[PDB]
Amino acid sequence: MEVIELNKCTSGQSFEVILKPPSDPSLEEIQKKLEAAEERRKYQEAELLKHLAE
Amino acid sequence: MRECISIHVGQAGVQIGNACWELYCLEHGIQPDGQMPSDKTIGGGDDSFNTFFSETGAGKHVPRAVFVDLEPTVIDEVRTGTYRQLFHPEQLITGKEDAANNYARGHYTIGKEIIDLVLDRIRKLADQCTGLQGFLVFHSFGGGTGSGFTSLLMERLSVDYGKKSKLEFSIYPAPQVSTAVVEPYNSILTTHTTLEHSDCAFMVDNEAIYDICRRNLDIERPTYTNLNRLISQIVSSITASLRFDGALNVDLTEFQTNLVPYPRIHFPLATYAPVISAEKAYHEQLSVAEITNACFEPANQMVKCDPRHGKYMACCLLYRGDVVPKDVNAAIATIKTKRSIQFVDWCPTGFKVGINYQPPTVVPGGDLAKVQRAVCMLSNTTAIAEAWARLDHKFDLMYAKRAFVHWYVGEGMEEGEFSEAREDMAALEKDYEEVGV
Amino acid sequence: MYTFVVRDENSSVYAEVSRLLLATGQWKRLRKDNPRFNLMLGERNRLPFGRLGHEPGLVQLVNYYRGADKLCRKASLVKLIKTSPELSESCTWFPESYVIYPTDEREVFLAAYNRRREGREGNVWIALISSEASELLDFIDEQGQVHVIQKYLEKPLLLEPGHRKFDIRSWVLVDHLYNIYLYREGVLRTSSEPYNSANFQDKTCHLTNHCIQKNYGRYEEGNEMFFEEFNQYLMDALNTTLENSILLQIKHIIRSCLMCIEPAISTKHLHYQSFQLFGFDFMVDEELKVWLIEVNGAPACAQKLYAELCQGIVDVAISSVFPLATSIFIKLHH
Amino acid sequence: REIVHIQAGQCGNQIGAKFWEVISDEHGIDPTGSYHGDSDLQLERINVYYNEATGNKYVPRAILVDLEPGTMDSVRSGPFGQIFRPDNFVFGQSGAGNNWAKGHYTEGAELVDSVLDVVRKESESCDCLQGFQLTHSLGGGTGSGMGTLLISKIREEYPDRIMNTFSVMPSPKVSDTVVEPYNATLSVHQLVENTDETYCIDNEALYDICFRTLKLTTPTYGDLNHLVSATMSGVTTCLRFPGQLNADLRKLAVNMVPFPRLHFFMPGFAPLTSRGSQQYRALTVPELTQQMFDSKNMMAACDPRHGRYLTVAAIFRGRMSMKEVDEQMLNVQNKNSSYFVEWIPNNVKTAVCDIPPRGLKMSATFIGNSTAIQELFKRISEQFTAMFRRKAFLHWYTGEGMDEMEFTEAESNMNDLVSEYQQYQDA
Ligand SMILES: Nc1nc2c(ncn2[C@@H]2O[C@H](COP(=O)(O)OP(=O)(O)OP(=O)(O)O)[C@@H](O)[C@H]2O)c(=O)[nH]1
Ligand SMILES: Nc1nc2c(ncn2[C@@H]2O[C@H](COP(=O)(O)OP(=O)(O)O)[C@@H](O)[C@H]2O)c(=O)[nH]1
Ligand SMILES: COc1ccc(N(C)c2nc(C)nc3ccccc23)cc1
Numbered sequence A: 001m002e003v004i005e006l007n008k009c010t011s012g013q014s015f016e017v018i019l020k021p022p023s024d025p026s027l028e029e030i031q032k033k034l035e036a037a038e039e040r041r042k043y044q045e046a047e048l049l050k051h052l053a054e
Numbered sequence B: 001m002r003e004c005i006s007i008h009v010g011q012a013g014v015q016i017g018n019a020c021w022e023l024y025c026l027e028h029g030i031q032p033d034g035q036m037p038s039d040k041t042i043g044g045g046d047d048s049f050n051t052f053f054s055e056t057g058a059g060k061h062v063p064r065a066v067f068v069d070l071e072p073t074v075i076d077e078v079r080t081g082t083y084r085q086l087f088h089p090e091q092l093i094t095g096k097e098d099a100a101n102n103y104a105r106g107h108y109t110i111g112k113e114i115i116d117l118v119l120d121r122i123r124k125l126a127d128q129c130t131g132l133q134g135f136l137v138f139h140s141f142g143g144g145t146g147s148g149f150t151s152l153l154m155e156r157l158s159v160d161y162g163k164k165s166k167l168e169f170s171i172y173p174a175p176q177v178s179t180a181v182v183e184p185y186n187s188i189l190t191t192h193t194t195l196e197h198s199d200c201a202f203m204v205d206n207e208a209i210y211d212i213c214r215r216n217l218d219i220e221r222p223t224y225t226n227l228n229r230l231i232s233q234i235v236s237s238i239t240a241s242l243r244f245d246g247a248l249n250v251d252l253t254e255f256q257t258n259l260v261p262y263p264r265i266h267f268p269l270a271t272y273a274p275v276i277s278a279e280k281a282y283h284e285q286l287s288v289a290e291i292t293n294a295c296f297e298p299a300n301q302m303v304k305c306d307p308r309h310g311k312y313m314a315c316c317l318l319y320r321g322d323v324v325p326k327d328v329n330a331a332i333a334t335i336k337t338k339r340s341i342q343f344v345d346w347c348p349t350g351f352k353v354g355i356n357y358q359p360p361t362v363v364p365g366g367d368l369a370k371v372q373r374a375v376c377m378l379s380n381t382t383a384i385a386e387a388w389a390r391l392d393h394k395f396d397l398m399y400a401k402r403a404f405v406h407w408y409v410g411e412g413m414e415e416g417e418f419s420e421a422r423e424d425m426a427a428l429e430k431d432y433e434e435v436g437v
Numbered sequence C: 001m002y003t004f005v006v007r008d009e010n011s012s013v014y015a016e017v018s019r020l021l022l023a024t025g026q027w028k029r030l031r032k033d034n035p036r037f038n039l040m041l042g043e044r045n046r047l048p049f050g051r052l053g054h055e056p057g058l059v060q061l062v063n064y065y066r067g068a069d070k071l072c073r074k075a076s077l078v079k080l081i082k083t084s085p086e087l088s089e090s091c092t093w094f095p096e097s098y099v100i101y102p103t104d105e106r107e108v109f110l111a112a113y114n115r116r117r118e119g120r121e122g123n124v125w126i127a128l129i130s131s132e133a134s135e136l137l138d139f140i141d142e143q144g145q146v147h148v149i150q151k152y153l154e155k156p157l158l159l160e161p162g163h164r165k166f167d168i169r170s171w172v173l174v175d176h177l178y179n180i181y182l183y184r185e186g187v188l189r190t191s192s193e194p195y196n197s198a199n200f201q202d203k204t205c206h207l208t209n210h211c212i213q214k215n216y217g218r219y220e221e222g223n224e225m226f227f228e229e230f231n232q233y234l235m236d237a238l239n240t241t242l243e244n245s246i247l248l249q250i251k252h253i254i255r256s257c258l259m260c261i262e263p264a265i266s267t268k269h270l271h272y273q274s275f276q277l278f279g280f281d282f283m284v285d286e287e288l289k290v291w292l293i294e295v296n297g298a299p300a301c302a303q304k305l306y307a308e309l310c311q312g313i314v315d316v317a318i319s320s321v322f323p324l325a326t327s328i329f330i331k332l333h334h
Numbered sequence D: 001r002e003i004v005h006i007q008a009g010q011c012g013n014q015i016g017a018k019f020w021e022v023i024s025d026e027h028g029i030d031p032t033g034s035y036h037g038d039s040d041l042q043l044e045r046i047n048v049y050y051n052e053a054t055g056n057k058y059v060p061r062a063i064l065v066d067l068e069p070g071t072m073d074s075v076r077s078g079p080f081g082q083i084f085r086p087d088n089f090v091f092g093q094s095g096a097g098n099n100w101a102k103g104h105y106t107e108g109a110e111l112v113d114s115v116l117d118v119v120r121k122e123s124e125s126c127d128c129l130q131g132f133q134l135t136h137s138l139g140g141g142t143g144s145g146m147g148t149l150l151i152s153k154i155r156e157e158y159p160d161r162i163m164n165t166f167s168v169m170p171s172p173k174v175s176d177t178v179v180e181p182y183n184a185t186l187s188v189h190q191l192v193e194n195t196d197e198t199y200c201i202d203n204e205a206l207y208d209i210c211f212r213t214l215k216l217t218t219p220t221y222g223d224l225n226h227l228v229s230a231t232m233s234g235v236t237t238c239l240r241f242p243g244q245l246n247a248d249l250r251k252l253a254v255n256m257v258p259f260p261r262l263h264f265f266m267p268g269f270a271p272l273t274s275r276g277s278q279q280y281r282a283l284t285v286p287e288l289t290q291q292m293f294d295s296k297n298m299m300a301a302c303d304p305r306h307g308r309y310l311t312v313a314a315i316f317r318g319r320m321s322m323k324e325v326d327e328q329m330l331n332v333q334n335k336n337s338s339y340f341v342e343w344i345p346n347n348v349k350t351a352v353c354d355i356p357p358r359g360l361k362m363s364a365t366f367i368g369n370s371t372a373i374q375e376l377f378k379r380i381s382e383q384f385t386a387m388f389r390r391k392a393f394l395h396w397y398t399g400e401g402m403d404e405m406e407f408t409e410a411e412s413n414m415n416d417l418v419s420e421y422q423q424y425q426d427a
């Protein structure tokens, strides 16, 4: 019912209508997580190459 | 004037980026080469459109956009396509091999080699800004690059640009058009890693867009081009307030203020009307009351859910075309008495309204018809948690047997990260429950 | 070949429905967790409505209306009648009722209690039945959960011979198109021991539940009087039919209750479809005036009528959506 | 995204030559290597299987391997023989004599280094290598023993690349020697560990299709290879042609293989044709969908009704209603939902290519990871134990240095695979 904050211009207009009232990880931590994942990849490839060496 | 940088990641992000930027160009009267005949201040300026376009001395208007894919094929079509002259080569970043539908391959393996290059190219656009306000990120939940690389980038942007706002345009996975069986894994994984780093996220369920295209546009089997042209119309409605003169949603901080009172519950539901077929002979033009009424039909929503069995935290109506305030208030009064609109007890039961007099621009030879008036409603309803429930259930079914998990572990990721991501999602589902009943 | 899933085992009604569906040879039952179903005969609690209508190439239907618990819980029904303009505070078919929490409308309840006291008229209430307000409130806190304090019907219609109390149960099925179907056969759940006006402690003659009664089986088998016998009694004893004296008011209450909630629960434009069977419970007073007691979300039928109602549920609720390769219902028009 | 193709042994080279014959026709390449097609859709991803030679002449990225000169001379003097790079022909002289041990340990070990030099030379030309596809039988000596020796060595030098195989299974119905269950079991043991994807081409099934359905009362190897090359064309369609799904070997592996060991696929094809006689009535979309899922059309002699589908990939070829394709594909899943695992949601994916194969207006190819494939491995295991319990014919293997222990281990790993497939049939 109550029409507040009415602002007009050439492009258009905007308003608010109320009907009823109420009642981060750092760069060092990122580089660590990515490299810990690379160590697990390298280990799994090394265990594969060791198995194929046998 | 405060500039915005658009970031398009993966197939879905890039292709939607094509659609959005083609649309922005037609709206501001910018030609495929980059010239803007209506623009009088050559080589610079701080008009409302300059939020999305920078200017060269030659008179070219270049998007503040960066396209990144771990695979060359999709951006190669941008490089050679009708809008090749619009972007400068440095804005378009491509890898050798894609993430193969694998989050871990996108985030950890192939992500690590390209992350520093991307942030450097982002820095090149950011250093052209006199007052950067933040980023608009376009990506899929389901893709390997879209899920994996996006969440790594979102982490890094919080470090380099900590004081800035980050908005998401995300593609929720749908079996109808999906490319991968592991898309529920990718979706839960990216949501968990991105949740703290995103300020407002607009979810788009491919299922909803697909049915709208079948039902309203009479397209038998909708392609990505069909979906993207529609998605771009919705994106354009959301972004219009940044690109045009107005007093509602003028900056990215206002999106958080107007739509997101609870930082974690930052997924507003978009609803758009009307979607009318271009090759429909004789169409009775819909009034303000009719198109506002369509904003509360679930068949017009970007996510299929029932707002009646949930609570609202915020509501925006963004009109484009022949619309006056008096018509809007009359429509709101009628709708309130006929429908179930339940706000939370700690919020005003109200609507923030923005009208732009310029009627929606449609792509020539498109599937969409020219309309006298259109509307996009953005509402933060607890009902959108239904989409989380669906996705979490699909995740649980696969994870119980540890199906496909070995592909993720093989890229260096740990099995603990899966269940950590699932716990955060369980917490998110709980947040919506506390607020919503 | 249509497909269904069963998620309520305790449901005596839908056990017979799942039996009847298989018997046609055009329905196959799937496992509980199979998403690829046409029909769901779902659980009473925590039914996952958000998962329904998301299977491409399948029309999905459920045997419950989402949001219809607002009519079926005692606390919710009072709140719904009191707030919705279609029913309003001055509802004349609903007894004076108040919502009470254990340590809300306590001061509002006591204001009506004093008007009854200073008016020196009948001041008996139900929660368990007592005449004193301070002895009722102490019982509510002693239990733990939320309860409704309702005006007790001190002067009910009493069946002869016996001087007995009763309640009427009506079975109502709302389909996917929101047609309201009242099943022609109702049942009178009777007291077998005479209604005592003075002693409210005796819970056997005041409450007409099928479990509390189980003089059981004296006048009719299993304390259940059917509609033909009750019509016949009213003609002989009061010079009126069941249709006029009682059934018009019953048809009015059912229709008013479900018309009220329609915009909140309707699945007219949704991606999934709903139907639901309801149990409306009615009290009749000595002046032949009908009062609503409770609405049931998961009602149980009476033994004589199980076969007929369950075939009706298949006919108008299930087969109307999924057709196969005289009507037992009265349609309440709106 | 480039693929290196290797063909080993008689069977491997025979089905391999037929593969290049069929797919060159689809891409519009004559036996000289010149392009004589009309559609540009043929050339968009031609780099996947072909290298572009100077003078604009295409060359298959194909390495031809055998321990005998006999079969490769049949390829060279054959129809499309001139298209293959003459250096990529690597041959021994004395053969493998249907002996896995000769292929893997003695005769094949002498020649394997020469093959790997050619593999490396092809790999260095590649902008981005996807990995490798091998065609071979498991019943012989070269394709079986040396083929699995190659895979093991290729995995050592390229551990971050995909290994795909087309593996022909032996049957008593189409039998060269008695020792084939020995050779197959020794091979399967290697494939379970060293491949990402294996197409199980059962000779039993190819025979039964030729006899029962195609009505050929005494089928040759040529009749058998006709069904193989038609399937091989179909399964590689999404690698060879641009679509909505830009598919590669890794994406197929990620999406089809829920558990690393269970990577044995049951291929299917509709409509079933024989050579010479052309069928004139084109099939409707409901007919293709009904046929490709039927056990009579499966290239592995398993009954899918005796198991459950973990994942399915379906490729429809020709000009047709994609709406009707989607409707029919959903129809099969909904009507038969008990035969698809509930714990992998939306486990059936469908792709459409506009280009049909030779002699067909429209066709359907089926790639299924069913638990019913255990029946194939049980059959080989039963034939193995019948001879091995009496240590029969074993001297051909111990004479080349193998111990009985190696047979017991290979028997064990395949029996493990069988119970591993059985695990997901119930829970
Ligand atoms: N709406 C829309 N959705 C798309 C489009 N392209 C892909 N998708 C959806 O995105 C999901 C797959 O993600 P993609 O973006 O294709 O994958 P990607 O980010 O390139 O990652 P990889 O290819 O796995 O490295 C699926 O659910 C598709 O339905 C598009 O142009 N529009
Ligand atoms: N389908 C098919 N199977 C074959 C062909 N040639 C041989 N085989 C089968 O392969 C097995 C023998 O392997 P072969 O390739 O001749 O031995 P290799 O040359 O030492 O590898 C037997 O089980 C045969 O049935 C062929 O051209 N097509
Ligand atoms: C079970 O879900 C799947 C399964 C396979 C895929 N991919 C990647 C496909 N790869 C290839 C090479 N061919 C196909 C043909 C037809 C359909 C898909 C593929 C995607 C999803």
Ligand SMILES: [Ca+2]
Residues within 6 Å of the ligand: B039, B040, B041, B042, B043, B044, B045, B046, B047, B055
């Ligand atoms: Ca300017």
Ligand SMILES: [Mg+2]
Residues within 6 Å of the ligand: B010, B011, B071, B098, B099, B143, B145
């Ligand atoms: Mg991609």
Ligand SMILES: [Mg+2]
Residues within 6 Å of the ligand: D010, D140, D176
């Ligand atoms: Mg031979």
